[PDB]
Amino acid sequence: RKMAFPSGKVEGCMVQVTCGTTTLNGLWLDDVVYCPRHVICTSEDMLNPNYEDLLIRKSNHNFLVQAGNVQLRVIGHSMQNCVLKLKVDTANPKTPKYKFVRIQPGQTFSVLACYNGSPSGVYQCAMRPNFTIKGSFLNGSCGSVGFNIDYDCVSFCYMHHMELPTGVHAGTDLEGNFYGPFVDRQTAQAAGTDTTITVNVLAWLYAAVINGDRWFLNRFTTTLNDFNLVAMKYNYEPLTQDHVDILGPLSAQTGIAVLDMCASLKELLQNGMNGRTILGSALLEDEFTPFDVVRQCS
Amino acid sequence: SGFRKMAFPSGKVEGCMVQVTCGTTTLNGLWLDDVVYCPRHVICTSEDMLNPNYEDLLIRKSNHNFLVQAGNVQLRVIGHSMQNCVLKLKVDTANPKTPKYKFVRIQPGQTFSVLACYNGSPSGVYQCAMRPNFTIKGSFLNGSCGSVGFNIDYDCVSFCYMHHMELPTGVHAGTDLEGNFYGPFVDRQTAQAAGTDTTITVNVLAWLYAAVINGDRWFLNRFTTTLNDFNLVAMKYNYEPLTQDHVDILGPLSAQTGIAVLDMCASLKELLQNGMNGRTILGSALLEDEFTPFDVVRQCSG
Ligand SMILES: *[C@H](O)[C@H](C[C@@H]1CCNC1=O)NC(=O)[C@H](CC(C)C)NC(=O)OCC1CCC(F)(F)CC1
Ligand SMILES: *[C@H](O)[C@H](C[C@@H]1CCNC1=O)NC(=O)[C@H](CC(C)C)NC(=O)OCC1CCC(F)(F)CC1
């Protein structure tokens, strides 16, 4: 089961930010609201926006920030890469313990999808190898955030900025740097060739074994390098020795050596699944990490 | 592709989760106003689990036997009663985080969010579909009982599920918040069989409407059917028969696409009888049955 983190600590931070006729979401931590800087653009700016030039011309009173029924007074603003930081006169009392992190491709995070500053859904996503995410984001979702929770600390890793023509999504970390080669201008942008997160597929196969599903296993083994040759042929990410180590606990628990599971996955890539399904799925799932699988077995 | 299982934000429910302990048995409870709701089998020992005498077990209990805690803070119990398979513990403090709420009993095919909890602490949130045999495919471990399933409409939380047990096949069973089990199950430590599962027809039809909304409509044909005729055919392919309520909840998607429900039923009947023929719908040769008409509207139209 693809499981998201409980979203309560993040819901208490979502606000609505408006400039002119553009409305999106902001993240209110302490006395600062973070949001995508493209809220300051008009239609006639969106194609090549000189954001520093646009921002020096804005006044504090041009930003309308609403937390529920309350308006928050903006008392200063600055820009950090693609994120606007609005200083407000009030501290958010619901601010959790938090940090800002930049996640690696193949890592997963929960998305709290918001519209008009109101949370609407929560779901799990992975940072794709090509630095897109396969999200569910509609108009007005910008400023929705992705996060992980460790103990009582919320680690914010993603803020939503745009959709690509293929229907996948792109955004930044909370320092405002995009993941991937994307730019916050209103243009049709393609991503690099995506690849499949091999260590995650292996984690998921182990999960299927842990739940009594093992039709895809076989008697064979493979070397790491020979596996990686076939993996790259099928546009799967290479498996590193650190990946093999990370899979150690699932390997121990199931009694199935990592390179044995690699030989199972090699068979599935070359032979297909031929009708069969694994954990309900007709496709190999690659948005469960080893940690995710273990968190949900313990 | 295009669609994913999306849960409701869990914060309003997180603010109601507590733990309820009898002896060394700890499970989760739901604290709303000055009442805590939880599975009655918290009052059981292992010697009593094969066929507990819940009525006698409850007479032996007093208020001071129940440890209710929000985090590490004890909530004093001032009354107790049993309603079907749920224990209702009156407490001396009204939960200040109580949302607007209602208790609803859902129908098979309906989806809901589960906030999986252990020792009163949330671990994760995910969407579940109530199968036609009244089981769900949850991710529940020991200590998860009392976790709840819910939907959120406006600012109102509709609680529909409380978790009680696992079946030999690995699926899960539970009650509504009035303590009435979904399906033929009972809260005893015994092996119980779920009915053979079937495919959720109304959700498959929702999925076909979703495909049409997205411009994927090769499968629409020029014919219609009666509901009875479709139901008789559908049963032969292990699809659930449609109810009048199912026809009604497809109303909004029917109006959005202009395709009458019974016309879509005729298109589905042809897929069942003739198969996909190596074709796909929304990228898959498999028909999805875990997205309700409401789920589809939420993700197509927001
Ligand atoms: C912010 O709410 C919004 C979110 C997207 C709208 C629909 N789904 C989304 O995720 N973001 C934007 O509108 C950006 C703003 C730019 C200044 C970055 N633009 C955008 O996402 O454009 C969408 C594509 C659609 C296809 C296309 F070819 F026309 C090019 C742009
Ligand atoms: C409450 O936390 C717990 C939840 C289950 C533990 C593991 N996964 C779960 O969903 N519920 C129980 O332990 C119930 C208690 C009874 C009084 C209802 N018992 C139970 O779920 O038993 C599981 C079955 C498994 C198949 C079997 F044949 F072995 C018979 C017992």
Author numbering:
A (entry chain A): 4 to 301
B (entry chain B): 1 to 302
Copied sentences from the primary study:
Coronavirus 3CLpro is a cysteine protease that has two N-terminal domains containing two β-barrel chymotrypsin-like folds. The active site of 3CLpro is located in the cleft between the two domains and is characterized by a catalytic Cys-His dyad. The polyproteins are processed by a 3C-like protease [3CLpro or main protease (MPro)] (11 cleavage sites) and a papain-like protease (PLpro) (3 cleavage sites), resulting in 16 mature nonstructural proteins, including an RNA-dependent RNA polymerase (RdRp).
Next, compound 7j was cocrystallized with SARS-CoV or SARS-CoV-2 3CLpro, and the structures were compared to that for MERS-CoV 3CLpro and 7j. The electron density map for compound 7j in complex with SARS-CoV-2 3CLpro was most consistent with a single enantiomer, although it adopted a similar binding mode and hydrogen bond interactions as observed in the SARS-CoV 3CLpro-7j cocrystal structure. Compound 7j was cocrystallized with MERS-CoV, SARS-CoV, and SARS-CoV-2 3CLpro. Superposition of compound 7j with these 3CLpro enzymes revealed a similar binding mode among all three proteases. Compound 7j had a moderately lower potency against SARS-CoV 3CLpro and SARS-CoV-2 3CLpro compared to MERS-CoV 3CLpro in the FRET enzyme assay, suggesting that moieties forming H-bonds that were accommodated at the S4 subsite had an important impact on potency. The compounds were also effective against SARS-CoV-2 with EC50 values ranging from 0.15 to 0.9 μM in Vero E6 cells.
